[PDB]
Curated annotation (Swiss-Prot), chains B, D:
It comes from Caenorhabditis elegans. The gene is sod-3. Its EC number is 1.15.1.1. Destroys superoxide anion radicals which are normally produced within the cells and which are toxic to biological systems. It catalyses: 2 superoxide + 2 H(+) = H2O2 + O2. It is an enzyme of class 1 (oxidoreductase). This is Superoxide dismutase [Mn] 2, mitochondrial.
Length: 195, 194, 195, 194
């Protein structure tokens, strides 16, 4: 059934002064809405190509499904990842961060750095690799969804996520976003990934 | 489900340009595998889509492009080759002369880019309906040709020549022009113009 | 010798109301400056890797050279491509646009559309293909320089090029930029490409 | 300029796992070509850089990565194979057991991803000095392994197996473990830990 724009868990100004009201409103009401609308259109066209046996057409649609489907996935997670009252990591998550990265401080630095270094548009991720039972960090280009691991915490470093407030200074945004990291949600995602 | 098409000729009909063992393996093993895998991946993809698993549906894309591309590319390629391929129709020859100067220039230019492919892939002559022109391009791996109509393809995966030509890809790419099925290429051209 | 940030051919507010003063100032003084500074650093590291015979290291530096070197190339061209008094295409350029695209209106639409459709960060280009003696349009991802043809006119569709003024509405920017297309410069580039 | 290294063994020493014709062509023709081209491209690149032609220097990057990668990858690969490769040192075996459970799990997991390479490429076992762990990865075409130290590589370009194994890549990838030079792999491991 059809994809829909999820309501945010908070009002558009609830993350000030870390993320502005204007940024939240445009990012949700315009950017994410566009990914959803275009996603529904692409899924229709793909369902038609598959039904008709138009293999070339079905292949040709893949980048648009990845882009808009990834936009939907990534943003949906991102809204659940942000809070004014984020709390602290669960003990078990905190313990695993210490095991895999040494400390939360190291994790935040190492993820901030790779996220900061993204060339162009993309995302930084903290994820959980089920196979090897370890936390990992990665970046993704554009809206490519995080693959090979379960997403826990995402940082959108598309210039739309920060330019209106932080201008060119991407590092100020990436460092500041940790202050609104929704650790309750991130810990819930970690618990589910270990099931 | 998708099926392996029969070749329009016997496995040895392209000797001495492409060998029997190459045609047999290429068709019965390589193309077969793309077809069989295409069917498995299409099945996995339908489950993912019918269940709402967008992430898994996106994760299956590369296998669909690869095996689906494999099926598309090879199916065109077999129709592109002939023991006696004739000559290009007058309309195609005139178009080749318009857009490349001569057949010689087209062959050289398409051979050169196809030889230069880094890794596995394909060289193509195609027709851009929009700007009403012939174009040459390459594709990586089994990516299908997009943005123009395919007319003539040259498989430069190593499995396409190695048993016979060993490392000498250029010899294979220059030699395949001897068996280019110009009857088929011309028909694809005529159909691309309608 | 060392790369430097070129002075703009105009003052930071000279393209209002099509491109804001704030956008011009950040884009030149901060974004392009960063590409230049990082480019010089990367060229040094590459010259060292080559001198030492450190082939793996020289290969590893390539994405950063492409990114920052491309940033320098692309922006350098882009500033010369913009003017308040852009004039009109030379007769010969106009005649070739008509030959290859039917009309200027068609060219502007077709280039605007592909530029608008860029997934992520990138550029739209009008270029000249010397081999086939034809105008072409293309997009490039991120800062990848236009290859296979001589660049004539570039449209930066990184969100930094427009978000402060146009917000999410990229099409309004892409359509509007044609009003400040420096046709004198573009025509000069066309003449040189045909030599 | 770069040179083709001699093999540490005679062309037939890996029979029956890899044939004489494969080793000869692979070394004398494939690797030679990467070396020779590497030299040509390095020359073109130096002219571009010394003249300030940034655009042309960027345009030559893919040929440097490809031929330079080719030289890097093959040079490691020849040292990675042996008629009698021994067994992993105790320190490497313990590390393999820590990070993969057993040698069996490592072999299966690396074989599976290497077999799955779409097109040409390589499978690698490497060591991540930062997080102090073994990792497995694949690389496309001749891209060199980056972000970890290379320990053991498996060439899955078709030229590496086709003359002998034909289409049956899995057989070649499972069989190469028989000739993995664990003396060399262990030395690379010891050097990766210093
Ligand atoms: Mn976003
Ligand atoms: Mn093939
Ligand atoms: Mn820019
Ligand atoms: Mn090889």
């Amino acid at each position: 059934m059809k994809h829909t724009l999820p309501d945010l868990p908070f009002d558009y100004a609830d993350l000030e002064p870390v993320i502005s009201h204007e940024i939240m409103q445009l990012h949700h009401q315009k950017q994410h809405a566009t990914y959803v609308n275009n996603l529904n259109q692409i899924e229709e066209k793909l369902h038609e190509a598959v039904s008709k046996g138009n293999l070339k057409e079905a292949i040709a649609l893949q980048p648009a499904l990845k882009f808009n489907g990834g936009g939907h996935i990534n943003h949906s997670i991102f809204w659940t990842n942000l809070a004014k009252d984020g709390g602290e990591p669960s003990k078990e998550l905190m313990d695993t961060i210490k095991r895999d990265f040494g400390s939360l401080d190291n994790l935040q630095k190492r993820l901030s750095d790779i996220t900061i270094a993204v060339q162009g548009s993309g995302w930084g991720w903290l994820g959980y690799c089920k196979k090897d039972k370890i936390l990992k960090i990665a970046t993704c280009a554009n809206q490519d969804p995080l693959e090979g691991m379960v997403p826990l915490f995402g940082i959108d470093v598309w210039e739309h996520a920060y330019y209106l407030q932080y201008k060119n200074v991407r590092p100020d945004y990436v460092h500041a976003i940790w202050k609104i990291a929704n650790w309750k949600n991130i810990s819930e995602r970690f618990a589910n990934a270990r099931q």
